[PDB]
């Protein structure tokens, strides 16, 4: 059971490392036993999955017994358990996908509030921890909010989201307009 | 001891998969105990290696305990044993690098000879096996040569080079001009 955290619109690479004669039949399935991708002889076959055009692998690593599932342009909808069946064995990976917005623009006026919201899949309520460039931090679970923006908030904010031990770091630039 | 075969001007990715708390101190060294790259806290540090600007890793895989050494624009000179030291353990990978030319152009005249030469590092004499698009094959050890080009040689040739079990496939298009 491996837990990998991705970021909305980002690419993640789920790892699969077997222990057989450098590269042999394998394939990625979703908890739903749907085939995402596998190798056909020596080729690469992706079935009609919703991840069809955004899914790939690194075909030259199979020789090393590595069969990565690459997933570009990440959606919170891809969150899910992916299974990697390499000949006799199978690896299970849980992909948790997150997004983090700032409904205000990033260019606000001193005194105005700031609202950030974390987009998560029906499966999580994580630890959001954002710091002003000024050391001050705000924690939450979905909705964040700071009540008075100082000119001392301008900069670049760091939002740490935490899950089963793992963590994703988000960075936002807020322009506090005088 | 892992043997990976690369191709002149190509990129290879040497794999390193440990068994510790998702991502901890690691680094790649060459047989010569020279540091190629490692992680400094959480950053990426490449020393002054000859592979300095062509060397990389995939920094978001360390969380999965994978510490790849990527090496772009391959040279036969990069052939060598690379060691991957991940905390308590270390993996050794032998990178054999090959090139395969066709000293004639690829556009020859029927009747003319074809000479292909395999570029290898001082460490190998491999099995070169090239097939005309017409099933006929020519084997060698460094220098290949076909004495009479038929119009039945036009196409795309497949040159298989073999080493410790591994193999690299090269493909050349010869234009047999009538």
From Swiss-Prot, chains A, B:
Domain of life assignment: Eukaryota
Disulfide bonds: 16-84, 130-159
Subunit structure: Forms disulfide-linked homodimers at the cell surface. Interacts with LCK. Interacts with PTK2/FAK1. Binds to P4HB/PDI. Interacts with IL16; this interaction induces a CD4-dependent signaling in lymphocytes. Interacts (via Ig-like V-type domain) with MHCII alpha chain (via alpha-2 domain) and beta chain (via beta-2 domain); this interaction increases the affinity of TCR for peptide-MHCII. CD4 oligomerization via Ig-like C2-type 2 and 3 domains appears to be required for stable binding to MHCII and adhesion between T cells and APCs. Interacts with Aedes aegypti long form salivary protein D7L2.
Start and end residues of each Ig-like V-type domain: 1-100
Tissue expression notes: Highly expressed in T-helper cells. The presence of CD4 is a hallmark of T-helper cells which are specialized in the activation and growth of cytotoxic T-cells, regulation of B cells, or activation of phagocytes. CD4 is also present in other immune cells such as macrophages, dendritic cells or NK cells.
Associated disorder: Immunodeficiency 79: An autosomal recessive disorder characterized by childhood onset of recurrent and recalcitrant skin warts due to uncontrolled viral infection with human papillomavirus (HPV). Some patients may also have recurrent respiratory infections. Laboratory studies show a complete absence of CD4+ T cells.
Post-translational modification (record): Palmitoylation and association with LCK contribute to the enrichment of CD4 in lipid rafts.
Cited function: Integral membrane glycoprotein that plays an essential role in the immune response and serves multiple functions in responses against both external and internal offenses. In T-cells, functions primarily as a coreceptor for MHC class II molecule:peptide complex. The antigens presented by class II peptides are derived from extracellular proteins while class I peptides are derived from cytosolic proteins. Interacts simultaneously with the T-cell receptor (TCR) and the MHC class II presented by antigen presenting cells (APCs).
Sequence ranges assigned to domain Ig-like C2-type in this UniProt record: 101-178
GO cellular component, one term: plasma membrane
Species per Swiss-Prot/TrEMBL record: Homo sapiens
Keyword set, alphabetical order: Adaptive immunity, Cell membrane, Disulfide bond, Glycoprotein, Host cell receptor for virus entry, Host-virus interaction, Immunity, Immunoglobulin domain, Lipoprotein, Membrane, Palmitate, Phosphoprotein, Receptor, Repeat, Signal, Transmembrane, Transmembrane helix
Parent sequence residues shown: 26 to 203 of 458
Chief location bin: membrane
Subcellular location: Cell membrane
Comment block on domains: The Ig-like V-type domain mediates the interaction with MHCII.
Name the UniProt record assigns to this protein: T-cell surface glycoprotein CD4
GO molecular function, one term: transmembrane signaling receptor activity
GO biological processes: adaptive immune response; calcium-mediated signaling; cell adhesion; cell surface receptor protein tyrosine kinase signaling pathway; cell surface receptor signaling pathway; cellular response to granulocyte macrophage colony-stimulating factor stimulus; cellular response to ionomycin; defense response to Gram-negative bacterium
